Amino acid sequence: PDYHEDIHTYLREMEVKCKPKVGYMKKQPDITNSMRAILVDWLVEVGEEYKLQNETLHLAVNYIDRFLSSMSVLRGKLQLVGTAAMLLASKFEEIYPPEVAEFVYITDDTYTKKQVLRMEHLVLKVLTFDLAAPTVNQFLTQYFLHQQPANCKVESLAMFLGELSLIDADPYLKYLPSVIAGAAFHLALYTVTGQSWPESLIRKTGYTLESLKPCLMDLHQTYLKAPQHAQQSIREKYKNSKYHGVSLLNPPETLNL
Amino acid sequence: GSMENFQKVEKIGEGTYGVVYKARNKLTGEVVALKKIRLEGVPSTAIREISLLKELNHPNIVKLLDVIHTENKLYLVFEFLSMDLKDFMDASALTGIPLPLIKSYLFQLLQGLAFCHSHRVLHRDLKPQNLLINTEGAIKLADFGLARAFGVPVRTYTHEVVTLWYRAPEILLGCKYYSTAVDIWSLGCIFAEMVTRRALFPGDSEIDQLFRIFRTLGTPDEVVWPGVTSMPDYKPSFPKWARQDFSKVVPPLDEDGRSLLSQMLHYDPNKRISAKAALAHPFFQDVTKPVPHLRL
Numbered sequence A: 001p002d003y004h005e006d007i008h009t010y011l012r013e014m015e016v017k018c019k020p021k022v023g024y025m026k027k028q029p030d031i032t033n034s035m036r037a038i039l040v041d042w043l044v045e046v047g048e049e050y051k052l053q054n055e056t057l058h059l060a061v062n063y064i065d066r067f068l069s070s071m072s073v074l075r076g077k078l079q080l081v082g083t084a085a086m087l088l089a090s091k092f093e094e095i096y097p098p099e100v101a102e103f104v105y106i107t108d109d110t111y112t113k114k115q116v117l118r119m120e121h122l123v124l125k126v127l128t129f130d131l132a133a134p135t136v137n138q139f140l141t142q143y144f145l146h147q148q149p150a151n152c153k154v155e156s157l158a159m160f161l162g163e164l165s166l167i168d169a170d171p172y173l174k175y176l177p178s179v180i181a182g183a184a185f186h187l188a189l190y191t192v193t194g195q196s197w198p199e200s201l202i203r204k205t206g207y208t209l210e211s212l213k214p215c216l217m218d219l220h221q222t223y224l225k226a227p228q229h230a231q232q233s234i235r236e237k238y239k240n241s242k243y244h245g246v247s248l249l250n251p252p253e254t255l256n257l
Numbered sequence B: 001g002s003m004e005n006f007q008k009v010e011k012i013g014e015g016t017y018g019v020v021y022k023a024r025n026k027l028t029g030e031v032v033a034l035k036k037i038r039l040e041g042v043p044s045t046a047i048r049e050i051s052l053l054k055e056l057n058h059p060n061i062v063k064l065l066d067v068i069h070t071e072n073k074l075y076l077v078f079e080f081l082s083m084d085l086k087d088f089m090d091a092s093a094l095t096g097i098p099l100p101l102i103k104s105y106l107f108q109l110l111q112g113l114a115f116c117h118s119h120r121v122l123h124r125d126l127k128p129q130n131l132l133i134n135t136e137g138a139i140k141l142a143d144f145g146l147a148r149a150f151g152v153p154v155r156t157y158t159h160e161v162v163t164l165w166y167r168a169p170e171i172l173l174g175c176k177y178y179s180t181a182v183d184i185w186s187l188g189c190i191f192a193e194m195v196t197r198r199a200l201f202p203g204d205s206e207i208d209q210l211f212r213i214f215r216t217l218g219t220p221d222e223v224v225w226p227g228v229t230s231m232p233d234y235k236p237s238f239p240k241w242a243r244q245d246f247s248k249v250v251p252p253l254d255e256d257g258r259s260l261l262s263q264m265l266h267y268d269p270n271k272r273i274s275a276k277a278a279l280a281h282p283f284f285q286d287v288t289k290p291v292p293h294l295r296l
């Protein structure tokens, strides 16, 4: 209402300030995009197991990427970073976060409670306690208000596509959350209803299909290739009636862009 | 920023985390408030308080100056303010509070709150004990331990919220969604309390709270608040109190003050005035910022 525009403007400012370093993986001696993809897929599973909000998943990924933007991490410790990130995101975002004991349990006893808690402190120090990061999800829910009329399949499909983007650092680290959300919303709208990025959102965001095209071309390929991806937890998650079974929908063969 | 530079002066309050201390920076002379955390890991309340205060730099929001760590302690270093509004109202027991100061404080509280809301923060514990005043006439929102960053549109958040006397009817009736309007309700209760120096709705239970509100503003029906009779905790057996003369709610208020209070206490959160809109209310046409009339 009175604050929708102010909040959008503020989130557009903060997503630039909260953006991880695009080239960080090249600077990591021991970890790879593939290892990151495995971790994020596991976080999706953890989110499923404990019925966490999508927003929590998106925050944890932001924390991890920001952390890895300045901290070298060995492959054996990557899951510890992810576990602490998810614990922090849950404390920030959830009404009822899982207990620390529960995070210790889902590492399959790889780490101790002390390690998890010490890692929590380290992540907070590295991120300088700056946890209120904008996410793809936060932009998506704003964009959804521009539907004519509202369509649950569009919303769930946009969320699915936004989540798929979390898995693959190449190429998605180069795009801002507001842009990924724009691409996801357009692609979902087009798949379900045949409609396109609405003019009301051009007025809100300043983005056009032209400006969204590079991200949209990438997202379309990710969508087309999703059944073949090594990581499948997101596809499995979005089979659920909670998300209207949207991972069952067929992607469009072409976009006309 | 390290603990060796601070000299503790005296206890100035109690919260979660525990006791709050006044301290002095030995090198700069700056007087600060120190909030100490004993180290389930870092408390969610602390995580939210720190993360949100770091974004919220505004003259009417208490300033978080530093966070000092250790393995086992976490200190939050805040700007020091001399008194809270509750203690100020108690000090004004027989003088009353000058209208120019009530007006100034409300205007400043609305400014701080508008800033919070425009930065997607809900405070959720606005009460006089959490509003701090200084010797230069400022009032500032404090204690963000119960705050949260919200989304557009909101989803369902914690149902505990807001200390009972200041709790909005949409929380009391169990609505799945609440948003910025909950903070405006609290400020409306605080506005009334500045004028009368007694809580507007001093309930002891959720139902007592609701009935106190209903006896003051009338029991809401579908015309005044569409959807109310279908809310989870609405009961058809609720007494249907008439709405009294609104001028009797806070008798000293004049036309403009009454108008503003009535808009802050609208039942329907949609209709309830925003902090941003309230800044332009004619009640503030002559607003100034004088110092408090009493030694703090």
Ligand SMILES: Nc1ncnc2c1ncn2[C@@H]1O[C@H](COP(=O)(O)OP(=O)(O)OP(=O)(O)O)[C@@H](O)[C@H]1O
Pocket (backbone or CB within 6 Å): B012, B013, B014, B015, B016, B020, B032, B033, B062, B078, B079, B080, B081, B082, B083, B084, B129, B130, B132, B142, B143, B145
């Ligand atoms: N920056 C500050 N300067 C001066 N006093 C402060 C400051 N911060 C907090 N206090 C004092 O501490 C008191 C309570 O702390 P706070 O409101 O932060 O936590 P709380 O959990 O709400 O406490 P309680 O639950 O007892 O009301 C306030 O009434 C205030 O007088």
Ligand SMILES: [Mg+2]
Pocket (backbone or CB within 6 Å): A025, A026, A027, A028, A029, A030, A031, A032
């Ligand atoms: Mg590498």
